Amino acid sequence: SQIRQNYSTEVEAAVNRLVNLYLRASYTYLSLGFYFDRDDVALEGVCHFFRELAEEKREGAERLLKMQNQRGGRALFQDLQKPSQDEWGTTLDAMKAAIVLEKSLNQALLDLHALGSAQADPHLCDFLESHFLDEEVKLIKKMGDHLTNIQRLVGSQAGLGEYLFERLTL
Amino acid sequence: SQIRQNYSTEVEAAVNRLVNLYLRASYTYLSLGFYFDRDDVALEGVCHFFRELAEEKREGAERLLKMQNQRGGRALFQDLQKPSQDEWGTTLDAMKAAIVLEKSLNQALLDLHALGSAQADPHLCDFLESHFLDEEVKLIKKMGDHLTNIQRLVGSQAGLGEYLFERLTL
Amino acid sequence: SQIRQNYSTEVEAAVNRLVNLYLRASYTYLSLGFYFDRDDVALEGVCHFFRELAEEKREGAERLLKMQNQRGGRALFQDLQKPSQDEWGTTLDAMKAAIVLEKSLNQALLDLHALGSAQADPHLCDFLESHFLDEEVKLIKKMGDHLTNIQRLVGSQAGLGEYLFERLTL
Amino acid sequence: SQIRQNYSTEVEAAVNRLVNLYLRASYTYLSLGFYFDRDDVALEGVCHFFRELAEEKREGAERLLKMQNQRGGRALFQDLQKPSQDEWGTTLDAMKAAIVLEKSLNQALLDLHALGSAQADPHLCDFLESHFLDEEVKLIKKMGDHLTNIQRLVGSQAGLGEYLFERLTL
Amino acid sequence: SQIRQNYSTEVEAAVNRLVNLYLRASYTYLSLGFYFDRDDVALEGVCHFFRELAEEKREGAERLLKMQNQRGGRALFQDLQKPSQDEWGTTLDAMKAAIVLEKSLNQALLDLHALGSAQADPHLCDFLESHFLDEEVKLIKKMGDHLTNIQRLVGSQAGLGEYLFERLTL
Ligand code: NA
Ligand code: NA
Ligand code: NA
Ligand code: NA
Ligand code: NA
Ligand code: NA
Ligand code: NA
Ligand code: NA
Ligand code: NA
Ligand code: NA
Numbered sequence: 148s149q150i151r152q153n154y155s156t157e158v159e160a161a162v163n164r165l166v167n168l169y170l171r172a173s174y175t176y177l178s179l180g181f182y183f184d185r186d187d188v189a190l191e192g193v194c195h196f197f198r199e200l201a202e203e204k205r206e207g208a209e210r211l212l213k214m215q216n217q218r219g220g221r222a223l224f225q226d227l228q229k230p231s232q233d234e235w236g237t238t239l240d241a242m243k244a245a246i247v248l249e250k251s252l253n254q255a256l257l258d259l260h261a262l263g264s265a266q267a268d269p270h271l272c273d274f275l276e277s278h279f280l281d282e283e284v285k286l287i288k289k290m291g292d293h294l295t296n297i298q299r300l301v302g303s304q305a306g307l308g309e310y311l312f313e314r315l316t317l
Numbered sequence: 318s319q320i321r322q323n324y325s326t327e328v329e330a331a332v333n334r335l336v337n338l339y340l341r342a343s344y345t346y347l348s349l350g351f352y353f354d355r356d357d358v359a360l361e362g363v364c365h366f367f368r369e370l371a372e373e374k375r376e377g378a379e380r381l382l383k384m385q386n387q388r389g390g391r392a393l394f395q396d397l398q399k400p401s402q403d404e405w406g407t408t409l410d411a412m413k414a415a416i417v418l419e420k421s422l423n424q425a426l427l428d429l430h431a432l433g434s435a436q437a438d439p440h441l442c443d444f445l446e447s448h449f450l451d452e453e454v455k456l457i458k459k460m461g462d463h464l465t466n467i468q469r470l471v472g473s474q475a476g477l478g479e480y481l482f483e484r485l486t487l
Numbered sequence: 488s489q490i491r492q493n494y495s496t497e498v499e500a501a502v503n504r505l506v507n508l509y510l511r512a513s514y515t516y517l518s519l520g521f522y523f524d525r526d527d528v529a530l531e532g533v534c535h536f537f538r539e540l541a542e543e544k545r546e547g548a549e550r551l552l553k554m555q556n557q558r559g560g561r562a563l564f565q566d567l568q569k570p571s572q573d574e575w576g577t578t579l580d581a582m583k584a585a586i587v588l589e590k591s592l593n594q595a596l597l598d599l600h601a602l603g604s605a606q607a608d609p610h611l612c613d614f615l616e617s618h619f620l621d622e623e624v625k626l627i628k629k630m631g632d633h634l635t636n637i638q639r640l641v642g643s644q645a646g647l648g649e650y651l652f653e654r655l656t657l
Numbered sequence: 658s659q660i661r662q663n664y665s666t667e668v669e670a671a672v673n674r675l676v677n678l679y680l681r682a683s684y685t686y687l688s689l690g691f692y693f694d695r696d697d698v699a700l701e702g703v704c705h706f707f708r709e710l711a712e713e714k715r716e717g718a719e720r721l722l723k724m725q726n727q728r729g730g731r732a733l734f735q736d737l738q739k740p741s742q743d744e745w746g747t748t749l750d751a752m753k754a755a756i757v758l759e760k761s762l763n764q765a766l767l768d769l770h771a772l773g774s775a776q777a778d779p780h781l782c783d784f785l786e787s788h789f790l791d792e793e794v795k796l797i798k799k800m801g802d803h804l805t806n807i808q809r810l811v812g813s814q815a816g817l818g819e820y821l822f823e824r825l826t827l
Numbered sequence: 828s829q830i831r832q833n834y835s836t837e838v839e840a841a842v843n844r845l846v847n848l849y850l851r852a853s854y855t856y857l858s859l860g861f862y863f864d865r866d867d868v869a870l871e872g873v874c875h876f877f878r879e880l881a882e883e884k885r886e887g888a889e890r891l892l893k894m895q896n897q898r899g900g901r902a903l904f905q906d907l908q909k910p911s912q913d914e915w916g917t918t919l920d921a922m923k924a925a926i927v928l929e930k931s932l933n934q935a936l937l938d939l940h941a942l943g944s945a946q947a948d949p950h951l952c953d954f955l956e957s958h959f960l961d962e963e964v965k966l967i968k969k970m971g972d973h974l975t976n977i978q979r980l981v982g983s984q985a986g987l988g989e990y991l992f993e994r995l996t997l
Pocket of ligand 3: 369
């Protein structure tokens with residue numbers, strides 16, 4: 148490109164891989180949201196928590212694609228793998244799956260930041276620090292808080308606890 | 318001082334000791350608040366209850382220092398001891414620790430009032446009656462109410478009760 | 488912690504030490520503020536300058552503790568040493584002490600940033616760059632400006648100059 | 658009186674003496690205010706500081722007379738002695754005279770409070786604590802602050818300092 | 828040009844030289860403004876006085892370039908010489924340098940007006956009378972007033988005077 152400066156082919160490829168990862172995560176959260184809308188599951192606040200995450204992760208992919216074109220890189224899309232499960236269990240199982248997925252996104256962000264640092268690409272480092280790394284730490288902390296609250300509610304009356312969480316936290 | 322009148326060295330020293338006690342209590346409540354913000358504890362209303370108490374106790378120290386200078390006494394600061402615990406247990410354990418601490422502050426206020434009375438210092442007596450003694454009785458009553466509500470919630474489903482208290486009272 | 492990722496024990500400990508340093512600085516500024524409120528000192532703008540700094544440094548400690556829990560580290564509080572002086576001299580002496588203290592906080596921030604960089608912790612580096620390093624440079628520049636203005640006012644009429652500074656700058 | 662209860666003849670007489678003292682102080686401050694309005698003195702902020710104090714002390718006398726009738730005591734007025742000086746010197750001399758006068762009022766208030774306490778008259782004790790003792794401590798602290806600021810301004814250019822104080826503090 | 832009428836090559840060249848002179852003066856005032864923002868100089872009102880002059884002189888250059896194109900002349904830019912000093916001394920030294928610079932701009936304006944008059948170019952004469960000559964006389968009078976006020980403040984307490992000027996005039 149006429150505009151490309153200081154933007155390695157390694158970073159360009161890793162940004163494309165990260166876009167795939169974010170779109171995969173959006174699709175996983177779409178599947179989690181619609182599972183909680185099942186008439187035999189029926190946890191509306193859980194459905195809305197995951198549907199909002201699906202939108203967030205799509206928006207993160209769109210911001211990475213915007214940056215890829217601002218740097219003069221070329222977006223390359225790959226197939227999007229289906230989510231790992233078709234049914235997601237309890238709200239506890241689902242929130243455990245969600246923190247595993249967000250940990251994996253965070254590790255991908257950290258790996259890209261490290262690549263950027265090795266390539267002396269400060270605009271990439273800044274972009275990630277500014278729009279991704281703190282949002283991901285904040286999200287992971289929120290999920291961990293949720294996770295602890297769900298766990299303390301299981302006790303010996305798991306249905307009751309699952310209802311309450313949904314009603315009073317989500 | 319040019320302005321000092323009717324202000325004994327005994328009262329001056331005891332006001333400095335009370336400032337230390339209030340600042341110690343602010344620090345204890347800061348530690349309690351951040352313990353309830355842990356991802357493995359995650360009781361937001363409990364965190365906010367103690368963080369608000371940390372601010373109150375700091376403000377009480379600042380009011381005592383203001384009065385010390387209005388009387389012509391001299392503020393003398395000492396080291397502030399760390400809180401008694403690093404981890405605070407359950408919300409019940411924490412509220413028991415908080416009432417023990419507020420009882421000890423109240424006894425210090427009563428002891429200063431008695432000193433004032435023995436020194437015939439009515440401005441000191443009035444200052445304490447006006448800004449401290451009723452606030453402390455009101456706080457201790459609120460903690461005792463909380464304490465009773467937490468206790469009735471333990472039953473055989475302690476996690477559930479701890480969640481509910483947090484959600485519906487705090 | 489379930490949420491901890493990329494957060495070294497070295498950084499965790501250094502954040503706890505920095506919290507102690509910020510709380511120590513808040514306590515120093517509380518002592519400076521109340522010294523200028525003495526009836527025999529009576530520099531209201533000087534008192535308000537330091538009282539505002541006490542609040543800032545407390546808020547900096549609270550932000551570090553928030554981040555410590557967002558990363559899955561554990562807050563550990565230590566005793567808070569009393570300020571270095573009981574009486575702080577002239578406004579010049581006090582502003583010299585304040586710049587020495589802010590230089591020492593800045594060096595602690597830089598040392599933590601360096602640790603973060605050695606540990607490849609970009610979220611820590613970003614957090615410090617975002618909330619601490621520019622605020623500290625801005626503060627140190629303001630104190631240096633004050634310092635120069637106080638110095639030019641001493642001349643042969645130090646009382647007059649101290650009054651004027653207080654009245655017309657603070 | 659039909660309404661008198663728990664109100665000793667000693668307290669009644671001492672309240673009448675305190676009314677005389679407050680009215681004397683109002684008259685002293687009237688003389689101080691008009692001295693600073695002299696064309697050969699011409700310190701407008703000093704004049705307004707003392708004129709406001711004249712009004713305060715008159716209002717304090719009126720509140721004591723109101724209380725005397727609410728208790729069923731009988732107001733008895735005596736001659737009001739002229740102020741101690743006809744010309745009041747510098748603003749420093751005048752503020753020294755004003756703090757001497759306020760110290761003497763405070764000692765009279767404390768003496769009445771002690772009498773009340775010896776007579777087991779809590780309504781009198783409360784009335785003084787509520788409307789007089791803290792106002793007098795606040796005033797004496799303000800005068801002491803002023804006093805320190807005037808003193809630091811004398812230096813070797815006393816006229817300049819007196820102008821500045823008036824202009825920038827009062 | 829198709830539009831050029833009554834616009835001599837001598838005037839065209841002198842307008843280009845005047846643009847250089849105005850841009851040089853803008854750069855001088857930028858250097859003066861940032862010198863007064865030094866932490867070891869720290870005269871904020873002095874910094875703002877010169878920074879505003881830097882903007883004025885840039886705007887004067889832009890108005891001359893606008894007029895050059897409205898007449899069908901051709902802008903020709905030359906190198907811009909650095910300011911005459913790197914450090915500017917006291918506010919007195921700086922205001923003396925500023926009046927020397929404004930006198931030199933005024934003499935350049937008068938010389939161009941004279942050229943215009945010799946070339947019978949009334950649109951040029953009007954343009955200068957309308958947008959430059961009275962603004963320059965007003966500015967030079969303001970600087971001279973400042974200069975007199977700074978001079979009366981030096982006395983035997985130059986620091987004090989420099990502070991006061993900055994605080995109370997600028
Ligand atoms: Na939405
Ligand atoms: Na951005
Ligand atoms: Na609050
Ligand atoms: Na009060
Ligand atoms: Na504030
Ligand atoms: Na932030
Ligand atoms: Na009035
Ligand atoms: Na009343
Ligand atoms: Na401007
Ligand atoms: Na025009």
